Amino acid sequence: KQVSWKLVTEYAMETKCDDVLLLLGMYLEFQYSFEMCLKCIKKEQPSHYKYHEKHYANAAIFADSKNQKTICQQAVDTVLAKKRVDSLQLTREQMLTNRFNDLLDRMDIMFGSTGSADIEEWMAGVAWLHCLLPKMDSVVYDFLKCMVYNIPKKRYWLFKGPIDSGKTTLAAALLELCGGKALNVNLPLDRLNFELGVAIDQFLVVFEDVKGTGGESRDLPSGQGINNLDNLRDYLDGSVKVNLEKKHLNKRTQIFPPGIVTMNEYSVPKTLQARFVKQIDFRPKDYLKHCLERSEFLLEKRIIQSGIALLLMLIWYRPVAEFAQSIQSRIVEWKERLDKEFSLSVYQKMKFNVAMGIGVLD
Amino acid sequence: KQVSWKLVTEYAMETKCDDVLLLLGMYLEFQYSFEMCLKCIKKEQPSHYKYHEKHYANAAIFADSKNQKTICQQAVDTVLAKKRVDSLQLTREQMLTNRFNDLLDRMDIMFGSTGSADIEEWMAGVAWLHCLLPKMDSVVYDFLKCMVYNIPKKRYWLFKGPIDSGKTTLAAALLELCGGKALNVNLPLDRLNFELGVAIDQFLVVFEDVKGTGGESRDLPSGQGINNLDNLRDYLDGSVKVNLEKKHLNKRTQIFPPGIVTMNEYSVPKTLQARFVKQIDFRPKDYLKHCLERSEFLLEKRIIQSGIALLLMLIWYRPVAEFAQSIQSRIVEWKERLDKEFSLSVYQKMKFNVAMGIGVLD
Amino acid sequence: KQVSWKLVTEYAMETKCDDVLLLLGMYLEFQYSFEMCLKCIKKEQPSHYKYHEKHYANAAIFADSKNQKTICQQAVDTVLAKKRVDSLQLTREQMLTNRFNDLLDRMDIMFGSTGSADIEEWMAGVAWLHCLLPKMDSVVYDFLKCMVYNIPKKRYWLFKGPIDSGKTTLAAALLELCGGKALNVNLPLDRLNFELGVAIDQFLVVFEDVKGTGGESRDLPSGQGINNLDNLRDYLDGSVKVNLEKKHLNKRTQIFPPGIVTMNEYSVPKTLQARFVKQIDFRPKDYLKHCLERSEFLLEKRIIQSGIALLLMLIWYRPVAEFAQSIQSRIVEWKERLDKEFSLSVYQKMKFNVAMGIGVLD
Amino acid sequence: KQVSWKLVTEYAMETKCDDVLLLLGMYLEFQYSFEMCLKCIKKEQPSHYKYHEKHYANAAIFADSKNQKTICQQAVDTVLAKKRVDSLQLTREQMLTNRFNDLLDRMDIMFGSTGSADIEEWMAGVAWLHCLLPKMDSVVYDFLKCMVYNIPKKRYWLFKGPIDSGKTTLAAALLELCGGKALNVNLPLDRLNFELGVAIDQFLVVFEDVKGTGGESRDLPSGQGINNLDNLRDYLDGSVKVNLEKKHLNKRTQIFPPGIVTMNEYSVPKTLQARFVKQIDFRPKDYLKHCLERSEFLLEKRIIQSGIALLLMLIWYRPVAEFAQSIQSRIVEWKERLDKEFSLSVYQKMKFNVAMGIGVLD
Amino acid sequence: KQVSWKLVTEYAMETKCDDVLLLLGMYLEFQYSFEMCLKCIKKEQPSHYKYHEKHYANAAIFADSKNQKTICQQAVDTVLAKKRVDSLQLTREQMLTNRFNDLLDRMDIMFGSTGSADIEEWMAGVAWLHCLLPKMDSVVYDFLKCMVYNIPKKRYWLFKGPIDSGKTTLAAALLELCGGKALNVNLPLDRLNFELGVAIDQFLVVFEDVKGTGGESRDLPSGQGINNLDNLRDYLDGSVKVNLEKKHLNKRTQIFPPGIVTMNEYSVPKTLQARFVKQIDFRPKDYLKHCLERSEFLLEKRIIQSGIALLLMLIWYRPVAEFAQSIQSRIVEWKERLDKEFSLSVYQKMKFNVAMGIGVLD
DNA sequence: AAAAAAAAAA
DNA sequence: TTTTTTTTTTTTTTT
Numbered sequence A, B, C, D, E: 001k002q003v004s005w006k007l008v009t010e011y012a013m014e015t016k017c018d019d020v021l022l023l024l025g026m027y028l029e030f031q032y033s034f035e036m037c038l039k040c041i042k043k044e045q046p047s048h049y050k051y052h053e054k055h056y057a058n059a060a061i062f063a064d065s066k067n068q069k070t071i072c073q074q075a076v077d078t079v080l081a082k083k084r085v086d087s088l089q090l091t092r093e094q095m096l097t098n099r100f101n102d103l104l105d106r107m108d109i110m111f112g113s114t115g116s117a118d119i120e121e122w123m124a125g126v127a128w129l130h131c132l133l134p135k136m137d138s139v140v141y142d143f144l145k146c147m148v149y150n151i152p153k154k155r156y157w158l159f160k161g162p163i164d165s166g167k168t169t170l171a172a173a174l175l176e177l178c179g180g181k182a183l184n185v186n187l188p189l190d191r192l193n194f195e196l197g198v199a200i201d202q203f204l205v206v207f208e209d210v211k212g213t214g215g216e217s218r219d220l221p222s223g224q225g226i227n228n229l230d231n232l233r234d235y236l237d238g239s240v241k242v243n244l245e246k247k248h249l250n251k252r253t254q255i256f257p258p259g260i261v262t263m264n265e266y267s268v269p270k271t272l273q274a275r276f277v278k279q280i281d282f283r284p285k286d287y288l289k290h291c292l293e294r295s296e297f298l299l300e301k302r303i304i305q306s307g308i309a310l311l312l313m314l315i316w317y318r319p320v321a322e323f324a325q326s327i328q329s330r331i332v333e334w335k336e337r338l339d340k341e342f343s344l345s346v347y348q349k350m351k352f353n354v355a356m357g358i359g360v361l362d
Numbered sequence F: 001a002a003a004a005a006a007a008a009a010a
Numbered sequence G: 001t002t003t004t005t006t007t008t009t010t011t012t013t014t015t
């Protein structure tokens, strides 16, 4: 009997593999007899134990096949095809709702019986993040609205401030919450062309720690990053479709995604400042630093960087009526869960602990 | 049974699908039965609900196929071949007439009972756009005439003015009305051959926010753009055929499209000014800014940069005899629809509100 | 039943089609039955209505085939192979005679019952174009003599003059008269490889706008152009073969074609200038500008740029003995036809109108 | 009978072979009959004598086959697929435990009856290494734990010190112990992309002697290293997934490995210093120099550079409980072997010897 | 019946086609029936009329083939393989003997019964070339011997003299006879290494117009050629193999080819002078100056710069025994053709006329 | 070399 | 017609 190419494509669609080698490796694991397999007995990785029993019959025939990478490439092309359909056909609020469901699925595994995560530690991350900027929940919601509305010159936010002020921390958390890519535009213009091609069909880009000039009076070393962004100001506007490029593929024409620019206090040209709708001035705080070294699980488990921490913040602080109709059902359930496991008094003591620089759980 | 490559060519041709991954994605959605399909029920996308019932039988066989991307490649090659033939064989009047028919089809769906667009909001777009440049309806007709009369060396228009003056706004509207591609020539000169290759068989190009050398007082960052356009000088002239590159394809040779250059008050060489038949000076106006702040639907729905806003402007202001004979009958219907839904007095109140800087609809 | 690949190759040879997508586009239009075919009934395009009835039966089978672009590649390669053979085999007067013969075929369909041109406008172009230089008929006979004789180190002519001097209008007409290609050599020297590849099997190349060095005293931007040409000095001399790379293919070696350099008043190094045969100093005239201004049809119909206008000028001025003995059979027919259209009086009158700076007509 | 592609993939997996030509050469060795095979009788290389008898039947049929590289490519693709699966799915503690197992498998061969090496020479390495830096066993355990926890922005170490001070010695030993590659960030900034592409799927990286711009007054050569490294801030941070590229391969998105920066006493900008957890001030020891001059087998055998000498240090000094529970069995066996072969007095004498700069083994 | 790929390969080997399109194009011309076709009847191209007769049957079946480019590619690959075997395995005498045979067969086409070239003008070329130096036939014959023997040190010749002394004329004639290439060593040292890469696999190289440094006390432009060339000592001597690199390609090792230095009369250092075996003082001759003007067809068809003109000089002046035994039969035929058309008295009169400045050939 | 685009075998 | 094998370019290097 022949290998079903349909079942490989179905597995790739269910797990959302863009990576042809990862799909090959995953599916080859399904060779071995389901009745005994240690990974399913451990329930180690969910993209295995949920799928092995279904795919075992096909994976045994797949292992005999002489064209295995051709099968996996078609399956990856089917996942890339659906992603390009979704980008052109979904409303941008549907795209965010789809990302929130994927994060809520990940939360259901993390905080259940199987998962390692302790919501007490993750909500301590919510408390630490809510102390970073004034009215942080409103900041997050206003960012989401901006990324959803995609208003044709009002699409980018600027994060500015010293070393260890929290810019990359909040940017990486918003990058996981919305989904997107990080781009390093400090590299020279002849390689920059392929860096920008990583934005093809993405929801956000974050331009991380871009360097200007005129910094040596502050011992900030100069670089080309801000001169590179001002050559790309066509891409930051998003009024017209730009032509993105990746190796061997012909150019794709699209509106370049919304995003965040993070920098130290270099000077920004007025032409580029015109592209940024809002600037957030991050300031280092002594108590946030003292709190983190007494609360090291926040850094080790990467809680303060995680989109799941900002999503928990939105669940805790925002009204139900702000979420899209599809997720409001799951959101109401998560609000009940947080009010069951924390009183307001535990959370208010967590924020008091942060302001004192004491360990968040103390 | 057997997969029909012909039917995929029909769907690609009717959808006018240039992208192999988009065609693959869309056609695979037809594999599910149209008796239950929620997107046929909801009628969310016209590229689906019109076609699914016809293509279900073939999409079920396509989903079992091992050739899937090869089937899609030939269909896409047929759509690109149809554009090649049209680009050589049609007069520029007929090419523009076809683009107007395509926009009028889209207007019918958009302003019909199935559609989401309030015609009153888009006619407020016509009012805002008409206040940007004096005699803008004549500017638009003069531009269309200029792009149809592909007169060598009298082919390109220059847009000049400060930050937030309207250059990108109007160029983006003309780009959608006429059809064309935006090009960035601020990137370095070794890489531009593949940027210029996007102009193959396009009706217009727009060279967007290109940067001058010098002029670093006034805080304008210098860049290669204007020198790169003084290079490439025969591309702008269009007396001679230029040679254009796509990856894995031989050098296509054609007269490079006419177009617009938008730039931010840099100094232009006399050699390059000799290529531009008309310069438009965009000037920032306080009342347009305050009008937009109070009538934000214009930016959220992207009305003021849409080709449909300019097409509605031409339908309102130009006499029918200036449109092509084939499209007269459809345009008389639209003039009747606008005069039915709008008096002149409602529209003159809209223009009065724009000059007042209050909300255009108030 | 099978496709005849030989009928597709016969169509490509008949129409001299060397673009693979254009051949696919053209031949697919034959799949509809010719008896109701509007494009045949209207006789719009000769490349369709001549051939549809013959190729219909094969195009129906071709439309069902699964390897359509392979069939077209072989047909295109047959046409490119003929162009390659005739480039190496033909005596260089037969090359120019062949090029005249299908310019005369092109004229014969322009001015016929299905025609779309006025001989008075095209001869008004001849009258205008004859004014541009002293004894223009002798100059074009000198140029064509140089291009057929192709004497080593005596192969190129230099056109210099300020803005709007006529050098591109004449080079573009000579380009169409000989059927060369225009090469932009202002790109970086390491990336001219595929652009010089366009010169393979051509009769001329025109170096439109080679930017020089030291133009600042004249407000002329500098660039790589002249220094690239001086690094191509062996290509200009033509004493040795050069190795030209073009894609889907191995490299072709040939003596590089002769040609024209057009140049806006830059400083030129003696090592370059010393090996052009003749420099023509173009300069503007007030009466030509007012004449073109008062007779817009010349520009709109591309008359003054056209090698058909220069070919008509050769009919009107040169003895019948100058043309090749084989083409004289067509030249003598056009000779009597132009006398039948125009007396010397109306020609001299329009020569006077040009000299008076009034509209060339009447 | 047909060739088993499965048995080749099995050989590739058991050998961990990811070079197509090496796999082809290795499997072609097996075609010659087992009973006669001189490589099996001499027990030359374990990758042959273990596997030949099993694969001879298949290798004879492989040696006749016409698609030998296609067979090996799939087998190499299967090994690379497992590497990419394990890269995403393992915890970093398991990655390090798998590396320690592969090292202990090497140690079995090195110090066994067939082995080629003397434990006393290698343990003299442990004594020389422990004297290089104070509390070296804690420094190495703290390093392992730092690379395993991978705390963002708290995950690179700085090895700073003058000429000949042991930096590259310890870095090479740590790089073999953990696995990883060295990077030369001093290259011109265009090359930097393909340098950084070496970090793909690696557990560590080391930046070997990054040169700065300062310190000409202390006789340190200027270079671009520190300036290039400060462009890579987000690569050192590890908060965001950076987009690495190899030659011709498309961009792969991952968290950049943690690691070590080695440099002479150039000045470090505060933005780059803020990304290093620990500065280890390496300084030259008179006694280590006089010791190596009289114990040169350490250099000849490459003992002090080797991760096996650092692993022996960890087996000697650290409690059993600090190792992963999977490998504790082997660690306990190796502690008993070391206590059997070396009295503490033998090791004490070695350290007293190197402290005096006497030959370690005296 | 099936196409013989062997007959296509045989045609390519007998025509020496490196070119896949030229092979395809010529072979398709054989598809027409031999009894009637015009190119045969004209006897115009020997690469057709010799071969069409036998290849007709194969070309008819080849015209129906679907593989046409694949067949020609294999045939061309055989001719390239033939060249690479000959390149590595021939003696240097055989390489020159093959160049001679190709030139004699090219001569026999030019001068035969179906000829196209006036043997008297080419013999006036011999008379003008012989007058350029004392004992020119000994200069030519000894130079050929030097390049053939390729003796270390005794390997380069210095062509020195005033401006307009014929130095580049004679070097160009020797290049075409021996099959070399020309180099520009004047460049600053940076790009010199890619310039030396021109020499890979060439038989002979010429250093064209080597500018010296010290001469500009006179009108001689000071340049770096001599001091560059002094440093290239190992390339000149040819004792040891040197690395050569073509752009974008890896280095190859070979003995750098023998050659000529062409110089204006700069001072030469003693160390460079030792590496030339002979210096030729070219001097200006007024009677040759006036002879050129009175005979200019020599320049118009470059007879006095063609390799065939020097080969005619060797055929006229040198004995049969000095030519290679393989070619002596064709040389005896060619000697008799010159003897029967030119008496020594008529040829001596040509030399006398040249010596008198009489350009008339008589 | 690695991939995209393209052609041959049974 | 189903299934496997082949060619060529891009990229990279270069400036």
Ligand SMILES: Nc1ncnc2c1ncn2[C@@H]1O[C@H](COP(=O)(O)OP(=O)(O)NP(=O)(O)O)[C@@H](O)[C@H]1O
Binding pocket: A132, A161, A162, A163, A164, A165, A166, A167, A168, A169, A170, A209, A263, A264, A282, A283, A284, A285, A286, A288, A289, A292, A299, D152, D153, D237, D271, D274
């Ligand atoms: N506001 C803050 N006050 C004190 N410590 C902070 C703050 N924000 C972040 N940190 C600490 O600094 C580390 C790095 O934060 P990060 O967001 O990368 O700083 P940043 O503003 O991006 N600095 P940089 O990227 O170097 O300009 C975090 O892991 C925290 O330990």
Ligand SMILES: Nc1ncnc2c1ncn2[C@@H]1O[C@H](COP(=O)(O)OP(=O)(O)NP(=O)(O)O)[C@@H](O)[C@H]1O
Binding pocket: A152, A153, A237, A239, A271, A274, B132, B161, B162, B163, B164, B165, B166, B167, B168, B169, B170, B209, B263, B264, B282, B283, B284, B285, B286, B288, B289, B292, B299
């Ligand atoms: N003439 C105008 N006066 C005031 N506001 C305007 C005007 N035109 C446009 N705007 C505002 O400017 C925004 C951007 O316009 P846009 O056409 O992109 O500017 P521009 O002239 O291209 N500036 P820039 O691209 O930076 O050179 C619009 O979204 C409006 O909010």
Ligand SMILES: Nc1ncnc2c1ncn2[C@@H]1O[C@H](COP(=O)(O)OP(=O)(O)NP(=O)(O)O)[C@@H](O)[C@H]1O
Binding pocket: B152, B153, B239, B271, B274, C132, C161, C162, C163, C164, C165, C166, C167, C168, C169, C170, C209, C263, C264, C283, C284, C285, C286, C288, C289, C292
């Ligand atoms: N001798 C002339 N005097 C005045 N106008 C002229 C003359 N020749 C041409 N023109 C006008 O100049 C326009 C462009 O001529 P063209 O030969 O393309 O310019 P040019 O000299 O090449 N300019 P440039 O390419 O910038 O050097 C034509 O379309 C005419 O309108």
Ligand SMILES: Nc1ncnc2c1ncn2[C@@H]1O[C@H](COP(=O)(O)OP(=O)(O)NP(=O)(O)O)[C@@H](O)[C@H]1O
Binding pocket: D132, D161, D162, D163, D164, D165, D166, D167, D168, D169, D170, D209, D263, D264, D282, D283, D284, D285, D286, D288, D289, D292
């Ligand atoms: N701490 C030390 N004191 C004295 N000699 C040492 C020390 N460590 C190493 N050596 C010797 O120095 C040699 C080079 O050591 P290595 O670790 O490569 O130096 P390094 O610090 O990397 N030098 P550099 O790379 O120039 O900064 C070793 O082979 C030893 O012979």
Ligand SMILES: Nc1ncnc2c1ncn2[C@@H]1O[C@H](COP(=O)(O)OP(=O)(O)NP(=O)(O)O)[C@@H](O)[C@H]1O
Binding pocket: E132, E162, E163, E164, E165, E166, E167, E168, E169, E170, E209, E263, E264, E283, E284, E285, E286, E288, E289, E292
């Ligand atoms: N003895 C002679 N005296 C003067 N002119 C001559 C003589 N012999 C030949 N010529 C002509 O000299 C011209 C230039 O010679 P050529 O060899 O091209 O330059 P050259 O001698 O290399 N000068 P240069 O390159 O500046 O060193 C040719 O066109 C010859 O026809």
Ligand SMILES: [Mg+2]
Binding pocket: A167, A168, A208, A209, A262
């Ligand atoms: Mg940062």
Ligand SMILES: [Mg+2]
Binding pocket: B167, B168, B209, B262
């Ligand atoms: Mg703009």
Ligand SMILES: [Mg+2]
Binding pocket: C167, C168, C208, C209, C262
């Ligand atoms: Mg011009």
Ligand SMILES: [Mg+2]
Binding pocket: D167, D168, D169, D209
């Ligand atoms: Mg070192």
